[PDB]
């Protein structure tokens, strides 16, 4: 959701992202880049993620010939599935309305009541 908590929780400062928004109102990263020549693989960004989007996976084979190719953009990070957390959806908890989930359709949320309603 491009909330920038992983980037600030990084003690090396090797995460850089910018928030963009769609027409329905959901937040997403416009870009998301990680300097892996700087990353110490400490897992603080995964620990700080409130949506369990950023994750550290069992993969160590990451060697490279040039250091510029250790900057991984969003096309090098986004995978096709949920990863280690298979069922969490942050937008099912958030009160912010997006496509396919209107106001009051989140978890533990009542339907909105107009102030013009006749009920006391």
């Amino acid at each position: 959701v491009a909330c920038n908590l992983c980037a600030v929780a990084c003690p090396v400062g090797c995460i850089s992202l910018q928030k963009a928004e769609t027409k329905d109102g959901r937040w997403y990263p416009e870009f998301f880049r990680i300097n892996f020549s700087r990353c110490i693989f400490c897992g603080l960004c995964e620990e700080a993620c409130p949506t369990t989007a950023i994750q550290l996976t069992p993969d160590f084979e990451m060697g490279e010939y040039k250091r510029q190719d250790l900057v991984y953009e969003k096309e090098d990070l986004l995978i096709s599935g949920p990863g280690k957390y298979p069922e969490y959806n942050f937008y099912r908890m958030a009160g912010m309305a997006i496509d396919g989930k209107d106001k009051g359709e989140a978890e533990n949320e009542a339907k909105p009541i107009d102030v013009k309603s006749l009920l006391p």
Binding site: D114, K116, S117, L118, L119, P120
Partner: protein, 156 residues
């Protein structure tokens, strides 16, 4: 496209004569519009604001604060049954069940023909004669679930 009638405006100004501030006639102006039209539509807020000289936000806040000013359309008759403590002791729940069975609606809703709108209300100050309801201007006491179908048929 809302316009205030001559009688409504004259009644509102006569209510404004009673107070040292024109703002003090907002509740009575909303009640005048409600009595003439059943409910208070969206343009009535701006019309009352323009007549009274107060902002429309104040009129809307007053109209939405008070439960007996209707900002949503209602039926031709408003049933208001009491769900307070003494009528709960006297068994208002049978009355509410009979009303929901006859009218086929939940409280806060209007019938399909626009005849009745069912509403719970606070204590009516008739607790010794409970359970009580109040249809449009008449308060009915000593209610029984068997008297509800006969009582509702006299309000055409």
């Amino acid at each position: 496209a809302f316009e205030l009638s001559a009688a409504e405006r004259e009644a509102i100004e006569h209510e404004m004569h009673h107070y040292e501030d024109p703002r003090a006639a907002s509740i009575e102006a909303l009640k005048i519009v409600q009595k003439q039209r059943g409910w208070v539509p969206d343009g009535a807020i701006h019309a009352i604001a323009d007549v009274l000289g107060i902002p429309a936000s104040d009129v809307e806040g007053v109209a939405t604060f008070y439960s007996q000013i209707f900002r949503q359309p209602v039926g031709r008759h408003v049933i208001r049954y009491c769900d307070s403590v003494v009528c709960h002791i006297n068994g208002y729940q049978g009355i509410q069940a009979a009303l929901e069975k006859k009218l086929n609606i939940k409280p806060g809703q209007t019938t399909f023909d626009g005849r009745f709108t069912l509403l719970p209300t606070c204590c009516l100050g008739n607790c010794d004669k409970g359970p009580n309801m109040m249809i449009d201007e008449d308060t009915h006491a000593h209610l029984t679930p068997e008297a509800i179908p006969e009582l509702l048929e006299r309000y055409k």
